Design a protein around this ligand. Structure first.
Ligand SMILES: Nc1nc2c(ncn2[C@@H]2O[C@H](COP(=O)(O)OP(=O)(O)O)[C@@H](O)[C@H]2O)c(=O)[nH]1
Ligand SMILES: COc1ccc(N(C)c2nc(Cl)nc3ccsc23)cc1
Ligand SMILES: [Mg+2]
Lengths: 67, 427
């Protein structure tokens, strides 16, 4: 009975620890992928704005060729 | 032959405090521990329950236990609270939340060694320890879970001492939480294995008595505990006073328990009185005898006519004819012989004590080992399974590390107890 008593309290400690552990890992993974995804969206937005500067340079070049 | 008393949890400490108030008054001890007593019958066996201190003070051999400090503060604030030895208050801070698992496995485990240290100190000063008596409820967390944890540890360290309990069974009519049937069933499983004798104090019966017989419309725990303290005083009479019997806890166990597991008693009391209001006509010995055997006077809500008395112990208190007491006790058995098992000859024993309890010229206390006690455990078993079949409210327990399997074993053991009581009701 003493053996079973400490196995019960060790089990309670193990479940509480595991819950804390999984919550900590779950949000660490969530914040990591959230940061990646937001950055990928901003990176794509700039990459298309920069293409607008590449195209605007070409436009002025073609005007020069017309002279 | 010293008894060590332990009271645990809210209910245990409240009925515990009342018991010490009541028997101290009977033995002529005031809240200071001084004896201003009339008779000398009062002191002859006073050492069964009291340590003597220098300056001829009498200190209860009592240990007060709780995982929560509140109701032990109220006891110390209480009338006789100054009589208890302050070192024998052992308490935690977090409470048990009405959870057997917390009292037994997580909160109670943290505190149980301190209690066992206090138990040890009191035992080492004993010339010859009889054993222990515990007051507790089975429906809460502390008295139920930690109380049964204490019983198990006390048995390991004192395996040749007697363990006696006054256990208050929960009732929906007087109920704190829905999980009482869980706590009670887990506790009964412990009581079956680890006590020699337990008085089943049924809050259902205490409520029915107050409502029906005592015409108290809204009974409080104060009204319930008046009944409890009267019963506790009566059933202890032959431990505390000199008589033709000079009983102790082991002889009570030997003569009341024909098979080890069937050690759960229905107590009875007469006359039934409410607190504060006194009635001025004493009973006749014939009246005492009939009332003490009446189902309306049982402190466990079971019908005695639904079973058989294996053994009975009866104690009559007050100045009366022992001849008339003998005739009336012989009368009830001879007229109702079918309700006493034929295979235990002369299974009714009567004792008389001259000192009556406070407020009564005459009283009768009844201790029955009846197969009808199975009704009590059946009632609790139904309430348990009603929730358990849907696993309702279990998370309170699995959250402390308990497994469903432990609930299944405790329920199955209590069903076996019911079967065994049924086995002897027909023999
Ligand atoms: N007769 C009686 N029963 C009580 C009293 N206090 C609590 N109870 C019962 O005990 C149960 C509650 O358990 P409790 O002892 O308060 O929890 P604990 O503090 O952990 O021991 C309830 O079902 C009540 O019916 C009391 O003063 N008298
Ligand atoms: C069935 O036969 C018996 C039942 C019980 C006893 N003993 C030991 C008692 N012990 C205490 Cl403490 N009180 C009383 C009161 C009346 S008997 C009794 C003896 C014989
Ligand atoms: Mg309570």
């Amino acid at each position: 009975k003493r053996e079973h008593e400490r196995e019960v309290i060790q089990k309670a400690i193990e479940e509480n620890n595991n819950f804390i552990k999984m919550a900590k890992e779950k949000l660490a993974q969530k914040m990591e992928s959230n940061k990646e995804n937001r950055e990928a969206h901003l990176a794509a937005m700039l990459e298309r704005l920069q293409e607008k500067d590449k195209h605007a340079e070409e436009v002025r070049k073609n005007k020069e060729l017309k002279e | 032959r010293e008894i060590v008393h332990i009271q645990a949890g809210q209910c245990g400490n409240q009925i515990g405090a009342k018991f010490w108030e009541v028997i101290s008054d009977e033995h002529g001890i005031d809240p200071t521990g001084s004896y201003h007593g009339d008779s000398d019958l009062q002191l002859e066996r006073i050492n069964v329950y009291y340590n003597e201190a220098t300056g001829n003070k009498y200190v209860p051999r009592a240990i007060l236990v709780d995982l929560e400090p509140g109701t032990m503060d109220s006891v110390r604030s209480g009338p006789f609270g100054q009589i208890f030895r302050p070192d024998n208050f052992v308490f935690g801070q977090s409470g048990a939340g009405n959870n057997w698992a917390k009292g037994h496995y997580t909160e109670g485990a943290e505190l149980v060694d301190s209690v066992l240290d206090v138990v040890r100190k009191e035992s080492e000063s004993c010339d010859c320890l009889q054993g222990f008596q515990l007051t507790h409820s089975l429906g809460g967390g502390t008295g139920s879970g930690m109380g049964t944890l204490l019983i198990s540890k006390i048995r390991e360290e004192y395996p040749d001492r007697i363990m006696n309990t006054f256990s208050v069974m929960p009732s929906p009519k007087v109920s704190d939480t829905v999980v009482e049937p869980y706590n009670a069933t887990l506790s009964v499983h412990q009581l079956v294995e680890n006590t020699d004798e337990t008085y089943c104090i049924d809050n259902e019966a205490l409520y029915d008595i107050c409502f029906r017989t005592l015409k108290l419309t809204t009974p409080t725990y104060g009204d319930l505990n008046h009944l409890v303290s009267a019963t506790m005083s009566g059933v202890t009479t032959c431990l505390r006073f000199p008589g033709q019997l000079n009983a102790d806890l082991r002889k009570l166990a030997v003569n009341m328990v024909p098979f080890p597991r069937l050690h759960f008693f229905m107590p009875g009391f007469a006359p039934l009185t409410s607190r504060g209001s006194q009635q001025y006509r004493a009973l006749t010995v014939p009246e005492l005898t009939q009332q003490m055997f009446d189902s309306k006077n049982m402190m466990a809500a079971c019908d005695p006519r639904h079973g058989r008395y294996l053994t009975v112990a009866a104690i009559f208190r007050g100045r009366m004819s022992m001849k008339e007491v003998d005739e009336q006790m012989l009368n009830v058995q001879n007229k109702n012989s079918s309700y006493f098992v034929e295979w235990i000859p002369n299974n009714v024993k009567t004792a008389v004590c001259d000192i009556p309890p406070r407020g009564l010229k005459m009283s009768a206390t009844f201790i029955g080992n009846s197969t009808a006690i199975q009704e009590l455990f059946k009632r609790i078993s139904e309430q348990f399974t009603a929730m358990f079949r849907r696993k309702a409210f279990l998370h309170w327990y699995t959250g402390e590390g308990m497994d469903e399997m432990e609930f299944t074993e405790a329920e199955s053991n209590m069903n076996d107890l019911v079967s065994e009581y049924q086995q002897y009701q027909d023999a």
